């Protein structure tokens, strides 16, 4: 019957400043709220529990506070080490979870296409593949265009992690066509960006 | 040193059951309530239920009321958790977790993947992404590789044998609708560098026992 809220979702917060998340419950004199990290591909850490007890081995930048219904997890000085996921729980009951991320200045996209390789045309189908790399922050517009035909609904996006070097995102977008429809035309990536003056656009003829 | 060493990933057709051990040690298993915990692939926590280890007694959460069974085998320290009638939707890392005196959960099993699909297990098919002028920005070309139709989750990369690990950018796979994951593989490297050193990307799908090596040459 209880319900945990988590505000907001995702959080960017710059290198060294102050990051905090918010964890309100649906609801001895104890809390019983606990914040977890998480990263990819581990099970989550206990950050705090009781509201406000740091686990021991915790860096003391964490801290938890808040009663009643309404807990805040603190990040002071941010680390890109804490780029994570955290979670609140109450008894049974976890939040949805806020995704922490390192603020940086604006990067444009570098943007490289690849075209199908033979190899794949052989086995029936016909990938393009639209590169953006090393950029920030992780919005970016990716329009497929073919014969100058805007593509729309027929590729897939995937975003990397946040890069712990460069606190940058890459992205790809791939537009698959069988073959078929493939060899039917003649194939462009545009891309729009907030670091971008004007949108860049990389395109190579099949052949 | 408290440990909680959760059994390995598997792949299951809607329709069965999954059962997922988690072998404590390291503390006294009767003491503590251990708690089943699962998270869908991008997706938040959600508790199962719990089992005392001391009595057998369990609870579960309405929404698996009836599908989930939790045992344990105190003799080797051993919590199980048993999924029914699975459906794709119980795809998830599924974690054990002992609860602690402040009722947070303090230590967790590392999580086993469980896929719920009707897929069979495929190894991917991998295609160069090759530089060209096409993919040439200022000096640097971007180069890659794509792992295309694999079931199940997951699949590793690394290039030159792990020698080339600057500027790699591996992407998350996306699930099609076929049921296969994909996903690319790119690195960016100086554009002087493709006349002269050799670009190798390795992939490994352990699931299927599939490991490709592919040179990705220019133009």
């Known amino acids: 019957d209880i319900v945990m809220t988590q505000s907001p979702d995702s959080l960017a917060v710059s290198l060294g400043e102050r990051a905090t998340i918010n964890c309100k419950s649906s609801?001895?004199?104890?809390?019983?709220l606990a914040w977890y990290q998480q990263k990819p591909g581990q099970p989550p850490k206990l950050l705090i529990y009781?509201?406000?007890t740091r686990e021991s081995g915790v860096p003391d930048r964490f801290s938890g506070s808040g009663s009643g219904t309404d807990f805040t997890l603190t990040i002071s000085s941010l680390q890109a080490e804490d780029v994570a996921v955290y979670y609140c729980?109450?008894?049974?009951?976890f939040g949805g979870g806020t995704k922490v991320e390192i603020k940086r200045t604006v990067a444009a996209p570098s943007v490289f296409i690849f075209p199908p390789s033979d190899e794949q045309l052989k086995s029936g189908t016909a990938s393009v593949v639209c590169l953006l790399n090393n950029f920030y922050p992780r919005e970016a517009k990716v329009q497929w265009k073919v014969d100058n035909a805007l593509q729309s609904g027929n590729s897939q996006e995937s975003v990397t992690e946040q890069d712990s070097k460069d606190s940058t995102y890459s992205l790809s977008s791939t537009l698959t066509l069988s073959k078929a429809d493939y060899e039917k035309h003649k194939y462009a990536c545009e891309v729009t960006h907030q670091g971008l003056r004007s949108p860049v656009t990389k395109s190579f003829n099949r052949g | 040193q408290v440990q909680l060493v959760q059994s390995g990933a598997e792949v299951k057709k809607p329709g069965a059951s999954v059962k997922v051990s988690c072998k404590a040690s390291?503390?006294?298993?009767?003491?503590?309530?251990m708690h089943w915990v699962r998270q869908a692939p991008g997706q938040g926590l959600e508790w199962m239920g719990w089992?005392?280890?001391?009595?057998?007694?369990?609870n579960y959460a309405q929404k698996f009321q009836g599908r989930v069974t939790m045992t344990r085998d105190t003799s080797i320290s051993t919590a199980y958790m048993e999924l029914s009638r699975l459906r794709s939707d119980d795809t998830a890392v599924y974690y054990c977790?002992?609860?602690?005196?402040?009722?947070?959960?303090?230590?967790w099993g590392q999580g086993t993947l469980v896929t719920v699909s009707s897929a069979s297990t495929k190894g991917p098919s991998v295609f160069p992404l090759a530089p060209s002028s096409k993919s040439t920005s200022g000096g640097t070309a971007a180069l890659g590789c794509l792992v295309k139709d694999y079931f199940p989750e997951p699949v590793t990369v690394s290039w030159n044998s792990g020698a080339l690990t600057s500027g790699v950018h591996t992407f998350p796979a996306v699930l099609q609708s076929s049921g296969l994951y994909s996903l690319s593989s790119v690195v960016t490297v100086p554009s002087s560098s493709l006349g002269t050193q050799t670009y190798i990307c390795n992939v490994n799908h352990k699931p299927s026992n599939t490991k490709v090596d592919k040179k990705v040459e220019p133009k």
């Open positions: 977790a002992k609860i602690s005196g402040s009722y947070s959960f303090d230590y």
């Open positions: 390291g503390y006294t298993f009767t003491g503590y309530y």
């Open positions: 089992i005392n280890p001391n009595s057998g007694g369990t």
């Open positions: 609801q001895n004199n104890k809390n019983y």
């Open positions: 009781w509201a406000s």
């Open positions: 729980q109450q008894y049974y009951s």
